[PDB]
């Protein structure tokens, strides 16, 4: 939302490897900011629906050889790319849809990598705080209505509304 990849060429959104801070940092002046250049904007949010304050969201994340520096944990080798990745999640739904293996166990058994630390999950999704087109997932379904493969972020992924 006017603060990620929809800004003018100059500041650009950046991160600080040390804490949970965030800034763009000028390229000419070399000055640090507090995110959001506000060089040409102000408002532009809202939608027009129930307007959910917040709802615990969860994802699996497949990850391929298209992202930045491929690294998992149980297999430091990803050459399947986003071409043959539609043959793992598609069938995985039949495993969670039956509740036989459940998403809980299947979470601490694969998940992805980083999110596969807290029992395959993240936490409460408030105001998004993540891929705009992704966060809209947990806010575009009912509590439990897990969405299949979503084309966004960096490949194919899934988002379920875990309340």
UniProtKB/Swiss-Prot annotation:
Looking at the record, the residues that make up the WW domain are 5-39
| Consequence recorded when altering residue 113 to A | Loss of peptidyl-prolyl cis/trans isomerase activity; decrease in DNA repair of double-strand breaks by homologous recombination slightly less efficient than that observed with wild-type protein. No effect on RBBP8/CtIP
Q: What is its EC number?
A: 5.2.1.8
InterPro entries the UniProt entry points to: PPIase_dom_sf, PPIase_Pin1, PPIase_PpiC, PPIase_PpiC_CS, WW_dom, WW_dom_sf
Modifications the protein undergoes after translation, according to the UniProt entry:
Phosphorylation at Ser-71 by DAPK1 results in inhibition of its catalytic activity, nuclear localization, and its ability to induce centrosome amplification, chromosome instability and cell transformation. Ser-71 is dephosphorylated upon IL33-stimulation of dendritic cells.
Lineage: superkingdom = Eukaryota
The record ties this protein, via SMART domains, to: WW
What tissue specificity is annotated for this entry? Answer: Expressed in immune cells in the lung (at protein level). The phosphorylated form at Ser-71 is expressed in normal breast tissue cells but not in breast cancer cells.
Residue ranges occupied by any PpiC domain in the UniProt entry: 52-163
The record's listing under Pfam families reads: Rotamase, WW
According to the record, mutating residue 23 to A results in: Reduced affinity for KIF20B
Q: Name one GO biological process term.
A: negative regulation of cell motility
Compartment(s) = Nucleus; Nucleus speckle; Cytoplasm
Tell me the subunit arrangement: Interacts with STIL. Interacts with KIF20B. Interacts with NEK6. Interacts (via WW domain) with PRKX. Interacts with BTK. Interacts (via PpiC domain) with DAPK1. Interacts with the phosphorylated form of RAF1. Interacts (via WW domain) with ATCAY; upon NGF stimulation. Interacts with PML (isoform PML-4). Interacts with BCL6. Interacts with FBXW7, disrupting FBXW7 dimerization and promoting FBXW7 autoubiquitination and degradation. Directly interacts with RBBP8/CtIP; this interaction depends upon RBBP8 phosphorylation.
Physiological role: Peptidyl-prolyl cis/trans isomerase (PPIase) that binds to and isomerizes specific phosphorylated Ser/Thr-Pro (pSer/Thr-Pro) motifs. By inducing conformational changes in a subset of phosphorylated proteins, acts as a molecular switch in multiple cellular processes. Displays a preference for acidic residues located N-terminally to the proline bond to be isomerized. Regulates mitosis presumably by interacting with NIMA and attenuating its mitosis-promoting activity. Down-regulates kinase activity of BTK.
Q: What is this protein called?
A: Peptidyl-prolyl cis-trans isomerase NIMA-interacting 1
In its UniProt entry, the species of origin is given as Homo sapiens
Supply the source organism's classification: Eukaryota, Metazoa, Chordata, Craniata, Vertebrata
